[PDB]
Amino acid sequence: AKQSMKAREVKRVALADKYFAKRAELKAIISDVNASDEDRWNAVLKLQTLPRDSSPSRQRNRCRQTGRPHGFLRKFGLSRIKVREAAMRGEIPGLKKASW
């Protein structure tokens, strides 16, 4: 359900590439432990203001083929409902029902 979160995610991967690539460990290099006596100063602590949407921490995905409100499953690119649906029709390979 609901296209706006699916719309957000599709824009995001080109915006990951554009903002975040040049500014991945830059947080760490300029501020944190990699800034060992170098940087840590104001004249360099203005450089990362473009990436905020681009960040992997907002790259939630959900169901990669329709969208779904939570309950995503990363190994299929699918969800609870949509896995069962694809299995009924035999579209998924290697698929047992558990018995041992």
């Binding site: 690539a21 991945a24 460990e25 290099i29 944190d32 432990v33 990699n34 800034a35 060992s36 170098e38």
Partner: protein
């Protein structure tokens, strides 16, 4: 002085000149408007904008976190 109870003379009759400003005193802050509290800031009683002591390491310049091979 009273007939049934007199003043004493044991320690309370000695040193008729002292002060805080006539003479030295080891304590200040006896006005109502000069008094301490020992406030230390909350969540910065020690340090929290901290220099690392659980993630300090030698300097590099890459882009990722233990990527290794890929």
């Amino acid at each position: 002085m009273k007939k049934d109870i007199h003043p004493k003379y044991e320690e309370i009759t000695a040193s008729c000149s002292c002060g805080n400003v006539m003479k030295i005193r080891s304590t200040v802050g006896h006005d109502l408007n000069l008094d301490v509290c020992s406030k230390c800031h909350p969540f910065f009683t020690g340090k929290q904008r901290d220099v690392a002591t659980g993630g300090r390491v030698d300097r590099f310049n890459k882009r990722f976190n233990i990527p290794g091979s890929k």
